[PDB]
Amino acid sequence: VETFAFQAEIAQLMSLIINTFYSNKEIFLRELISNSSDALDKIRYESLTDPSKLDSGKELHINLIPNKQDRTLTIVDTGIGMTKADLINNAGTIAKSGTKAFMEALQAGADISMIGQFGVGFYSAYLVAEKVTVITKHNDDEQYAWESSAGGSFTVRTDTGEPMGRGTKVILHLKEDQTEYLEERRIKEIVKKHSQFIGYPITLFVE
Amino acid sequence: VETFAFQAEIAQLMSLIINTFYSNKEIFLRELISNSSDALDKIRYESLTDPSKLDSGKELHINLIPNKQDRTLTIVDTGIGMTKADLINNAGTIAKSGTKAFMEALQAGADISMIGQFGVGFYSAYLVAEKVTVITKHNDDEQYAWESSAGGSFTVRTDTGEPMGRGTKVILHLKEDQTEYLEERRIKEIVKKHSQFIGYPITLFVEK
């Protein structure tokens, strides 16, 4: 298990997301589904010139998996996935400018719901999750598990458990008071409200 | 000059964009600036592992160039650009599956303004333009010019004209009744409304 420090600005944004009073927490789902949609666009585009890129799975979809026993909400996509380098480097220098701009926007009166306009929508997961695990598989690399309970660090390890073929699984280990996001009617409402017209099928799993 | 036929679905999308009554045409600028921003993110991401990727130009910006004499609005970016193969792939879009999903969404009550969510935002240019010319230069290919007045075809040719170093120029040949998009105050209003949080400087050029 390798341990890494978040880029300073990402650590600052994470503490802002965890500590700022903001009731409209439900936007985390919109942001994650948006990232899933973008990753799906990427593999679909690559497959136009090289169809073998879909040998790891032809279905391009998003699955929402609530689990009340584990207190987890999992967002699965069969997108392009991330290599070990992207998985690490995403929390590095690339995200510095967008994070810096977002925190400046917030100081100027912008809303936390605008996070996605700064390319850092992923960190909205910390509005509802105490810990986030990212399982990912890109065609050019092995399966890796990224994990962080914030605190300025994250870990990356090889994931040998259950191979996924290709894509990303975002496992949200929900805060004790955020279990409404495990309720079928609540998830349906949020999807209809914020992600009604996504370019890929969204399947809400039953418990 | 090579001439290509659009696939049936992308042809149907362009025809819908041209013929459907939809007054909120100004979203074309948000969509093009969004594509420019994404192309700029791509080159900036690649510049970190390989700094030589910026030898073709270090400045990362978006320029809006109205020209009332030519009746054109040009959107210039110093993004990653597009290869010839990208241009032939419906100007780097997931046009086939994107159109299919977008058409299905429109039938389910979605608005034309949601086009960009389907990876076909570029074709919103046809809300205001009778013809679109795309001049592009990717680090891994030569400079090319893509062009289409819709009508089921597009052309791709090598562009030996003024080099751009790296990036994309989208030249909108405006419809006769869409000249408001050449007005300084109109462009400023649209940029403020739909693109205030763009991560790259947007420069609106002055005329005369």
Instruction: Say if residues A118 and A128 touch (Cβ distance below 8 Å).
Output: no
- Which among A87, B164, A125 has a CA at the least distance from the CA of A115? A125
Q: What is the resolution of this structure in A?
A: 1.8
Domain map (residue ranges) of chain A: 1-207
- Which among A36, A19, A28 has a CA at the least distance from the CA of A199? A36
Structure tokens at A125: 């997961």
Experimental method for this entry?
A: X-ray
Q: How far is the C-alpha of B12 from the C-alpha of A83, rounded, in Å? A: 37
Strand B167-174 and strand B129-137: pairing?
antiparallel
Question: Which chain A residues contact residue B98 at CB under 8 A?
Answer: 199
Say which amino acid occupies A25.
K
CATH architecture assigned to A1-207: 2-Layer Sandwich (3.30)
Of B45, B101, B197, the CB nearest to A94: B45
Say which amino acid occupies B27.
I
Q: Cβ neighbours of residue A192 under 8 Å, at least 6 residues apart?
A: none
Burial class (CB in 10 A: 0-12, 13-18, 19+), A195: buried
Other CB atoms closer than 10 Å to residue A30's CB: what's the count? 19
Tokens 């679909």 found at:
A44
Q: How close does chain A come to B187, measured CA to CA in Å?
A: 20
* A49/B101 Cβ within 8 A: no
Pick the CATH number of B1-208 from 3.40.190.10, 1.10.30.50, 3.30.565.10, 3.40.50.1100: 3.30.565.10
Instruction: Say if residues B40 and B198 touch (Cβ distance below 8 Å).
Output: no
Instruction: Say if residues A50 and A24 touch (Cβ distance below 8 Å).
Output: no
Interface contacts (A, B; CB < 8 Å): 49
* A97/B48 Cβ within 8 A: no
Question: Which chain B residues contact residue A197 at CB under 8 A?
Answer: 105, 108, 110, 114, 117
Q: Cα A19 from chain centroid? A: 20
Q: How far is the C-alpha of B53 from the C-alpha of B62, rounded, in Å? A: 18
Chain B: residue whose CA lies nearest to A110: B197
Structure tokens at A152: 């300025």
Of B48, B94, B197, the CB nearest to A105: B197
